[PDB]
Amino acid sequence: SIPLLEYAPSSQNQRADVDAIIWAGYRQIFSEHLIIKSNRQSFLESQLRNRAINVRDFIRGLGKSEVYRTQVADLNSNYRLVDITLKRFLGRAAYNQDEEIAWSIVIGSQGLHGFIDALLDSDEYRENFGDDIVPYQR
Amino acid sequence: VKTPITEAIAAADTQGRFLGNTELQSARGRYERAAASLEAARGLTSNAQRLIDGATQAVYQKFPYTTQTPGPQFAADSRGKSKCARDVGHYLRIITYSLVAGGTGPLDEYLIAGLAEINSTFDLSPSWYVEALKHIKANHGLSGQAANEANTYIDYAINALS
Amino acid sequence: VKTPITEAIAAADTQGRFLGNTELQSARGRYERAAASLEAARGLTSNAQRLIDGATQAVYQKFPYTTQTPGPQFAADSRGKSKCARDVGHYLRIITYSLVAGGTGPLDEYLIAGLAEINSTFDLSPSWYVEALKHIKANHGLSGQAANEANTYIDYAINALS
Amino acid sequence: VKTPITEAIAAADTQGRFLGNTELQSARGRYERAAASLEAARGLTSNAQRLIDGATQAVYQKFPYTTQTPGPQFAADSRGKSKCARDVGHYLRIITYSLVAGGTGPLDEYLIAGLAEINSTFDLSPSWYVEALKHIKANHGLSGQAANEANTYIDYAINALS
Amino acid sequence: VKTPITEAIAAADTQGRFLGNTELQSARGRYERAAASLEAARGLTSNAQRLIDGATQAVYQKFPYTTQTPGPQFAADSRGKSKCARDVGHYLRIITYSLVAGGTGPLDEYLIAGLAEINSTFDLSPSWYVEALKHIKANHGLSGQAANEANTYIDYAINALS
Amino acid sequence: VKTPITEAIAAADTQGRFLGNTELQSARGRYERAAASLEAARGLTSNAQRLIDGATQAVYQKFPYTTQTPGPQFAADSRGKSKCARDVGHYLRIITYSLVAGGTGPLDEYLIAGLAEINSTFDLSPSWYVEALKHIKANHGLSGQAANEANTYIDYAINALS
Amino acid sequence: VGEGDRVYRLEVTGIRSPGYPSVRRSSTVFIVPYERLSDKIQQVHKQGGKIVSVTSA
Amino acid sequence: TLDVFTKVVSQADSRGEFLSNEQLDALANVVKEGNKRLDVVNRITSNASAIVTNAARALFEEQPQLIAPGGNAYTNRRMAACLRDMEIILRYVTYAILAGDASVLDDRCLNGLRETYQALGTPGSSVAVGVQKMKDAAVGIANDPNGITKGDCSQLISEVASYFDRAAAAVG
Amino acid sequence: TLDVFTKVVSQADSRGEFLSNEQLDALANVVKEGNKRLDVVNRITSNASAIVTNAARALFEEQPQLIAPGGNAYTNRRMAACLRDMEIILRYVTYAILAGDASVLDDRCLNGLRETYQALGTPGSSVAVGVQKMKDAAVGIANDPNGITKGDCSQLISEVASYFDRAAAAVG
Amino acid sequence: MTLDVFTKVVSQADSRGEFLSNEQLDALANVVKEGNKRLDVVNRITSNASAIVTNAARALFEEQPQLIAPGGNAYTNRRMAACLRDMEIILRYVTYAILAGDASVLDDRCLNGLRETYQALGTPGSSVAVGVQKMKDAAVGIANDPNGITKGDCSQLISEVASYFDRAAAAVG
Ligand SMILES: *[C@H](C)[C@H]1/C(=C/c2[nH]c(/C=C3N=C(/C=C4\NC(=O)C(CC)=C4C)C(C)=C\3CCC(=O)O)c(CCC(=O)O)c2C)NC(=O)[C@@H]1C
Ligand SMILES: CCC1=C(C)/C(=C/C2=NC(=C\c3[nH]c(/C=C4\NC(=O)[C@H](C)[C@H]4CC)c(C)c3CCC(=O)O)/C(CCC(=O)O)=C2C)NC1=O
Ligand SMILES: CCC1=C(C)/C(=C/C2=NC(=C\c3[nH]c(/C=C4\NC(=O)[C@H](C)[C@H]4CC)c(C)c3CCC(=O)O)/C(CCC(=O)O)=C2C)NC1=O
Ligand SMILES: CCC1=C(C)/C(=C/C2=NC(=C\c3[nH]c(/C=C4\NC(=O)[C@H](C)[C@H]4CC)c(C)c3CCC(=O)O)/C(CCC(=O)O)=C2C)NC1=O
Ligand SMILES: CCC1=C(C)/C(=C/C2=NC(=C\c3[nH]c(/C=C4\NC(=O)[C@H](C)[C@H]4CC)c(C)c3CCC(=O)O)/C(CCC(=O)O)=C2C)NC1=O
Ligand SMILES: CCC1=C(C)/C(=C/C2=NC(=C\c3[nH]c(/C=C4\NC(=O)[C@H](C)[C@H]4CC)c(C)c3CCC(=O)O)/C(CCC(=O)O)=C2C)NC1=O
Ligand SMILES: CCC1=C(C)/C(=C/C2=NC(=C\c3[nH]c(/C=C4\NC(=O)[C@H](C)[C@H]4CC)c(C)c3CCC(=O)O)/C(CCC(=O)O)=C2C)NC1=O
Ligand SMILES: CCC1=C(C)/C(=C/C2=NC(=C\c3[nH]c(/C=C4\NC(=O)[C@H](C)[C@H]4CC)c(C)c3CCC(=O)O)/C(CCC(=O)O)=C2C)NC1=O
Ligand SMILES: CCC1=C(C)/C(=C/C2=NC(=C\c3[nH]c(/C=C4\NC(=O)[C@H](C)[C@H]4CC)c(C)c3CCC(=O)O)/C(CCC(=O)O)=C2C)NC1=O
Ligand SMILES: CCC1=C(C)/C(=C/C2=NC(=C\c3[nH]c(/C=C4\NC(=O)[C@H](C)[C@H]4CC)c(C)c3CCC(=O)O)/C(CCC(=O)O)=C2C)NC1=O
Ligand SMILES: CCC1=C(C)/C(=C/C2=NC(=C\c3[nH]c(/C=C4\NC(=O)[C@H](C)[C@H]4CC)c(C)c3CCC(=O)O)/C(CCC(=O)O)=C2C)NC1=O
Ligand SMILES: CCC1=C(C)/C(=C/C2=NC(=C\c3[nH]c(/C=C4\NC(=O)[C@H](C)[C@H]4CC)c(C)c3CCC(=O)O)/C(CCC(=O)O)=C2C)NC1=O
């Protein structure tokens, strides 16, 4: 509800095909080992082949997936998770330490699911990657 | 990790709201069944040593080649039979763990997570372990509603095997 | 919409897995409270007309200026008092709706969603409606565990008001 | 924070380009407007103590129950009336702040941000503060174009209240 | 699908640039070996019927229980042995397909994609098929560099099995 | 950086799989091409000093105003002619670098990356450098397939210029 | 990815943006559910494409 | 997502009246019949993987060109494709018996499934020959008189089989 | 996220033995006292919004420079900031009493709390003067018997107050 | 964070919680009066913005000539275009600072983490501030010079235009 507190941004340097795309989405978020056998979801794979669900929409499911929450959300601290969340979708470590902290309080109020939805909504994120393109390092 | 008390929390936490009566109602349901679930834990813990060697010699019956073929994976060597009672004895631990937790969480996190990756690499056929668990669910001697209770989680490990 | 049977579904659907015993635990638990929750629905439906006019004349007591000040928003003339029993009578509907659903869902979707937007625009102070609901939770005449049951959802509407 | 000089910057910064002649025009507008806006600041600062006690006794007129009803929230005893001149005296500060800034920024960041959250919790009805601000915009004695200048920001706080 | 001519395209297409000399060089490499790869295709196509029944009776040797145990999964009666020469005969097709394509693409898309899902459900142990492919790579009678080429893809199916 | 051996790696690394026969084939192609590419490197290194002063006096022919107009960018005095043989002598280095690498990588990373940014700021017209490179590709005296080899990378720098 | 099944199909005509990298194909449908439909129509109009049809599903 | 409890709210909201006493006597039987739903539901999910392959063999043994070269169940990811969503029928039919109303079934298996099955080229009618073979095995397990106690599950069995018939009607 | 049920699993996994009978007699008392635990939880959440402002009638009245000009609770967003997360203490303390173990609370609520509270500039010690004022009002509501069957929930009251004392220790 | 001359004299006045004094309003009245000059200064800098950068690059590289010689960090072409892609970003934010009239928008972008990247990359940090001074020598030469304009003292603007370049050189060196 309330507008985000203004945080300073540190200067940064950064500032078969179908099957591969699914793997790429999985790879950035799960770092290879996590996909395993259990983490993979049949419905998400079907939607992409089906194309009913957009890639931007596809990632949200992975971000909000139960397997992801147990592995990262539960174990890690809220502040760490905000920093942790940034690498996989944004692809960039947060420039300002204070900014990361500001994000964490918001994450707690809306939950893990709430924070992920917010990242997609932000103008910088959509513009940087695009709906069609899988998230990549910046 | 997955528990009906945990599942009430993680549902209400991602919404950012308090504990409603719908999360609270779920907890109430767990208690009625947790009284009969702890009955199933003592039935498996007391009969633990009978059930392990009851199982690891039942799998040798249906698969007699597993004690004969010379392979690292095979249990024909004593070292395999030492790792036989370790592996099947690991199953009754996690089944008893998921009994007292009420959920499939400890079964989901300790046993079946990444089981398709490991059985392909070491060539352990999952038809072996499902034959031991059918022996456990028929020979635990449990009765009543507690006999239903162990029978879900054993059969839940069966479906995750295949 | 939010229901303990629904909350078992939407948790298991986002995970892409079947219904485990942890989603299925809640349903068993829910029936036991749902037996006492439907007791609370008949207690409010039968005493419905006593409770509405019991409430809309209790709010006139603590706020006597609401019948005196000439405003579209205030209940000065008969048109406000006609919209008085409509609004307070809308509350006992949704409270009885969330009783038989077992969750706060119908309360969350019909009543309190966007209530801060509407009370700011029409200048309806939310201190009025919380005074009527305190009259309802003390004068429904319900007893036993069913008296606890209506008392949560009334108090859940109180906290969402303020 | 929101200022026509700032709004020229944050528009040109997100594009990554220099200051064009279009960014400059917004800044140019402020100087002619800002000459008449600082006229409105001295008109409110010099008449500050007349306007606060002119306002906090005008709200007691239209709402006589606010001095009678005993509650922490109401201004029944002297502690509420001490917090009366604090709160209404906070409004004339931020109105005079947004006058000399030229934008609604200090009004947007100090006063109205999260005002719906606070008035619901402490049960302060926003119909009280809008009655004081109507007294200020009619009794500041300002004339000319400067009388228009204070009249926007007062009315901007009115719309954010309701 | 994966081919050295395709891999030059999909690399240069995702960059949005033309075909450089670095994508061009890769294409030439595929063409040069491709002269020895088509030697390996005729060596397997001409000896196809000897190699299938050479393989499906070699797996019956090391696993004699597969012709004895009564189960659909097993090759006890003639219907399993009819599905024996179908399945092993499917392998020599895709091995010959990935020979003339130069890449592992047809092997990656027709055979090994989702092989861990199917062998768990139908309880087909992957130790059976790896025993047939070791018979093929030792009994194809191929010589020279074509013997080396034929083996890679057989051994690539072996590693994907386990 | 872009190399047919590198392009096999970065393709297979982003898939997370091993080196298949398709990744390997690209490397194989380079050796046959790379035997004739190193022929083209010695042909340009031995004739290096003839080719630079052969080029920087050929551009003065077609553009006689470049030695006459007084400007910092223009090669009017000796300072420009000193920076003439530096710049054109930088081109034959990177052309010989991309010869022995087999790919356009060193040409892509040292020379043409951001060339449109630099030629706009210093007002160096890219029609100058393309006139020198046409002199190089016609006067290197190379023959056979090696004459084709230098002729791609020179012409690849031509297209990136315009 | 919508808490409930309330999905409305959207058809945009002509999307102007960086046209090679950012929007490679215009005149395509976007399948957004009920919760973000407020947000989605503001996203389309920022590029400048116009909506043809909005069909539920 | 609707229920038996929530759908008798949702039409009662559309008419805007309080819930009648005979609707509450109807829901009191739903709570009373509630325990039976769980027992039926747990037996299906515990034999969930055993149904699909047993249902599946008949599905391919009766129409044997499908896995023979040329059919749409021929290659191996195509074969794993009609086991990756043979179970999704069971994933949502078990959600329908849990909720007690087929309104969660018709958004996932019945909504756009007949549209993909034409464009895809996979036979649509060759699904509903085997979803009936699932129903023949599902109500055989749910109604088996083994363990627990004897009770009347006939009402549940007939409208458990009604969910499979709705699952076969919108595909064929 | 851990529990009373799951934490006595997690150390029992680390030693790798079966669960003993006196651990199951311990958990049988946890189930037995479960009904009492639920009642306490519902009274806190129903009086959740009434606690926070009644703590804010003393959190700001005792240290009155905080809302006076200059303090970090002065302006209106800043004031709504220490009501937006005064309740998050109650949002996670009620999660701790529900789970029965403070491991849920430690991971999110207090793991990074003492680091931000010197990065922002807020007084960290001026939080734990009022979280104690929440505990004085929380155990006053949870113990009082209104329309409730007589019972003894004293053990919960002391370790309900232990969760507030852990909530005050890692901020101060 | 983005602050001003108008907004910063609000922000400290909020922290003390008093009304704005009359001598602060007489201070801001001079800012409005001196405001017209500020717009003109920015206009001449941005119109000669691209002419400054290369004319600074005619000395930033001529004075330290190993930088573009083989081995230096301005050697290859992308690299060379890298120290023109952000030589102008100094001018992009210094002109934002003169427009706002306070350096609080300058210190979040060029001064915040710039000295950290400039040892992470390997670039000489001190070799930037030799040429940002060469920008200031050309910036105040253009802003100061008057052609077809009414003449008024611009010393306050110029002295503290050069203070923004000195802050831009201090946090890099
Ligand atoms: C200052 C470092 C140098 C300088 C400036 C200077 N300016 C003026 C007068 C004017 N400057 C402007 C500029 C603008 N007016 C606008 O509306 C805009 C768009 C935002 C601009 C850019 C104008 C219009 C005036 C006055 C009116 C007019 O010119 O028509 C003066 C003299 C007049 C005055 O005091 O305003 C001066 C001196 N002169 C120098 O020598 C400095 C180096
Ligand atoms: C808005 C604040 C901000 C700045 C300043 C910034 C700088 C920045 N400078 C970079 C590189 C670079 N910067 C230079 C700069 C220089 N070489 C010299 O000789 C000169 C002394 C100097 C310039 C005056 C060079 C050569 C590189 C490329 C280095 C390499 O790739 O090895 C990079 C990595 C590549 C890229 O541009 O994306 C970043 C992110 N980023 C920011 O967000
Ligand atoms: C805590 C839960 C848990 C279990 C149960 C588990 C089992 C497990 N058993 C393994 C191997 C093995 N498993 C067995 C067991 C058997 N093979 C036979 O021949 C018999 C039929 C059967 C026993 C009845 C044997 C003999 C090995 C060694 C095989 C090899 O080394 O290739 C392996 C791979 C190698 C290893 O670390 O030892 C794992 C991961 N891992 C776990 O984390
Ligand atoms: C289904 C659940 C539901 C409820 C309860 C509800 C209430 C509701 N009451 C309203 C107005 C009103 N509400 C009241 C009621 C009162 N004002 C008084 O003076 C008395 C103190 C008090 C009654 C005891 C009155 C008089 C109005 C008209 C005020 C106006 O028109 O400004 C309005 C705004 C205008 C409208 O459509 O009529 C809503 C939305 N809306 C809902 O969707
Ligand atoms: C800097 C901008 C700013 C303002 C204006 C502000 C107002 C503000 N006034 C409050 C209470 C109050 N506000 C009032 C004022 C009034 N009540 C009445 O009866 C009269 C009608 C009216 C005055 C005309 C009173 C009496 C209280 C105390 C109420 C209570 O303690 O419950 C409160 C909650 C408790 C507090 O800290 O004192 C806030 C946050 N806070 C801000 O940060
Ligand atoms: C084109 C690549 C391709 C292959 C290779 C393939 C194999 C394959 N073999 C199968 C069954 C089978 N596979 C076998 C083969 C064997 N079982 C034994 O006992 C022997 C050890 C072994 C042969 C050496 C048998 C007998 C069946 C039938 C088992 C059953 O019906 O349960 C099945 C499941 C049912 C079917 O449609 O027939 C598949 C999908 N599918 C593919 O798409
Ligand atoms: C390693 C690959 C590479 C090349 C080739 C390169 C060229 C290059 N030549 C430059 C300038 C120049 N380039 C030339 C060359 C010419 N001007 C003329 O009048 C003649 C027509 C022409 C030569 C035939 C001259 C004279 C300058 C200096 C111009 C100036 O200082 O404004 C500049 C800008 C300033 C500099 O650092 O010296 C670059 C970056 N840089 C690179 O990194
Ligand atoms: C590889 C497959 C592919 C293609 C082909 C493609 C083309 C393409 N050309 C576009 C625009 C455009 N394309 C043209 C082309 C022309 N107009 C004329 O009058 C000429 C005759 C003609 C060039 C010869 C123009 C003018 C635009 C801009 C239209 C506009 O701005 O409204 C756009 C969208 C606007 C943009 O971002 O620039 C696309 C997607 N995108 C792809 O992904
Ligand atoms: C009769 C034996 C048989 C079966 C079982 C069969 C199923 C089947 N389902 C398919 C596709 C599919 N099936 C689904 C189904 C779903 N995805 C979801 O996320 C939903 C929850 C669910 C519907 C409720 C989807 C989304 C596709 C994508 C491809 C298509 O549109 O066909 C395809 C396309 C071809 C392939 O996968 O190789 C097959 C083969 N084909 C057969 O020959
Ligand atoms: C063959 C036809 C048939 C069925 C289907 C049947 C089911 C059945 N399940 C029962 C009880 C029950 N069934 C369950 C089952 C569960 N509760 C949960 O919360 C778990 C998730 C789930 C197990 C996984 C429970 C808890 C009871 C309580 C009563 C008892 O112990 O039997 C009873 C007891 C008598 C009655 O309900 O009238 C019946 C009749 N009886 C029959 O004659
Ligand atoms: C889920 C567990 C959790 C907690 C509790 C938490 C607190 C927390 N409070 C914060 C700020 C804050 N905290 C407060 C609270 C206070 N300051 C005061 O003046 C009062 C004395 C006191 C309240 C009693 C305020 C007013 C801010 C905003 C300060 C600022 O923006 O600089 C911040 C940094 C900015 C933010 O995102 O909002 C965090 C991370 N974060 C967490 O993840
Ligand atoms: C999740 C929804 C839910 C709630 C809220 C719930 C509460 C609940 N509390 C109960 C009992 C009780 N609850 C209390 C609690 C207390 N007595 C005191 O004097 C103390 C101050 C206080 C604890 C601090 C006591 C003493 C009993 C007596 C019966 C028993 O031991 O359960 C019972 C027993 C059965 C009944 O009352 O019908 C219920 C239902 N049950 C539910 O299903």
UniProtKB/Swiss-Prot annotation, chain A:
Domain of life: Bacteria
Compartments in which it is found: Cellular thylakoid membrane
Domain PBS-linker as annotated: residue spans: 10-138
Function: Rod-core linker protein required for attachment of phycocyanin to allophycocyanin in cores of phycobilisomes.
Family the entry assigns: Belongs to the phycobilisome linker protein family.
Subunit note: Part of the phycobilisome, a hemidiscoidal structure that is composed of two distinct substructures: a core complex and a number of rods radiating from the core.
Name used for this protein in its record: Phycobilisome rod-core linker polypeptide CpcG1
Natural source organism: Nostoc sp. (strain PCC 7120 / SAG 25.82 / UTEX 2576)
Portion held of the full protein: 2 to 162 of 279
From Swiss-Prot, chains B, C, D, E, F:
Subunit text: Heterodimer of an alpha and a beta chain, which further assembles into trimers and the trimers into hexamers. Part of 2 PBS rod complexes, the conventional PBS rod and a photosystem I-specific CpcL-PBS rod.
Official protein name in the record: C-phycocyanin alpha subunit
Topology class, membrane: Peripheral membrane protein
Entry-linked Pfam families: Phycobilisome
CDD domains referenced in this protein's UniProt entry, alphabetically: PC-PEC_alpha (cd14770)
SUPFAM superfamilies: Globin-like
Organism of derivation: Nostoc sp. (strain PCC 7120 / SAG 25.82 / UTEX 2576)
Keywords: Antenna complex, Bile pigment, Chromophore, Electron transport, Membrane, Photosynthesis, Phycobilisome, Thylakoid, Transport
PANTHER family named among the record's database cross-references: C-PHYCOCYANIN ALPHA SUBUNIT, PHYCOBILISOME 32.1 KDA LINKER POLYPEPTIDE, PHYCOCYANIN-ASSOCIATED, ROD 2-RELATED
Chief localization: membrane
GO biological process terms held by the UniProt record: photosynthesis
Record family assignment: Belongs to the phycobiliprotein family.
Post-translational modification: Contains one covalently linked phycocyanobilin chromophore.
GO cellular component terms given for this protein: phycobilisome; plasma membrane-derived thylakoid membrane
InterPro entries, per database record: Globin-like_sf, Phycobilisome_asu/bsu, Phycobilisome_asu/bsu_sf, Phycocyanin_a
Binding site for (2R,3E)-phycocyanobilin: 84
Compartment list: Cellular thylakoid membrane
Keyword NADP listed: no
Protein role: Light-harvesting photosynthetic bile pigment-protein from the phycobiliprotein complex (phycobilisome, PBS). Phycocyanin is the major phycobiliprotein in the PBS rod.
Keyword Nucleotidyltransferase: no
Underlying gene: cpcA
Curated annotation (Swiss-Prot), chain G:
Annotated protein name in UniProt: Phycobilisome 32.1 kDa linker polypeptide, phycocyanin-associated, rod
UniProt similarity note: Belongs to the phycobilisome linker protein family.
Domain CpcD-like positions: 5-57
Region of the whole protein represented: 230 to 286 of 286
Functional note: Rod linker protein, associated with phycocyanin. Linker polypeptides determine the state of aggregation and the location of the disk-shaped phycobiliprotein units within the phycobilisome and modulate their spectroscopic properties in order to mediate a directed and optimal energy transfer.
Source superkingdom: Bacteria
Organism expressing this protein natively: Nostoc sp. (strain PCC 7120 / SAG 25.82 / UTEX 2576)
Disulphide bond pairs: none
Localisation per UniProt entry: Cellular thylakoid membrane
Subunit description: Associated with the phycobilisome, a hemidiscoidal structure that is composed of two distinct substructures: a core complex and a number of rods radiating from the core.
UniProtKB/Swiss-Prot annotation, chain J:
Keyword Ribonucleoprotein: no
Residues annotated as binding (2R,3E)-phycocyanobilin 1: 83
One Pfam entry name: Phycobilisome
Binding annotation for (2R,3E)-phycocyanobilin 2: 154
Subcellular location: Cellular thylakoid membrane
Major localization listed first in the record, in broad terms: membrane
N4-methylasparagine found at: 73
Membrane topology, from the record: Peripheral membrane protein
UniProt keywords, alphabetically: Antenna complex, Bile pigment, Chromophore, Electron transport, Membrane, Methylation, Photosynthesis, Phycobilisome, Thylakoid, Transport
GO biological process, one term: photosynthesis
Gene3D superfamilies associated with the record: Phycocyanins
Modification after translation, per record: Contains two covalently linked bilin chromophores.
One Gene Ontology CC term in the entry: plasma membrane-derived thylakoid membrane
Subunit and partners: Heterodimer of an alpha and a beta subunit. Part of 2 PBS rod complexes, the conventional PBS rod and a photosystem I-specific CpcL-PBS rod.
Similarity comment: family membership: Belongs to the phycobiliprotein family.
Protein purpose: Light-harvesting photosynthetic bile pigment-protein from the phycobiliprotein complex (phycobilisome, PBS). Phycocyanin is the major phycobiliprotein in the PBS rod.
NCBIfam families reported for this sequence: phycocy_beta
Protein name as catalogued: C-phycocyanin beta subunit
Native source species: Nostoc sp. (strain PCC 7120 / SAG 25.82 / UTEX 2576)
Phylogenetic lineage: Bacteria, Bacillati, Cyanobacteriota, Cyanophyceae, Nostocales
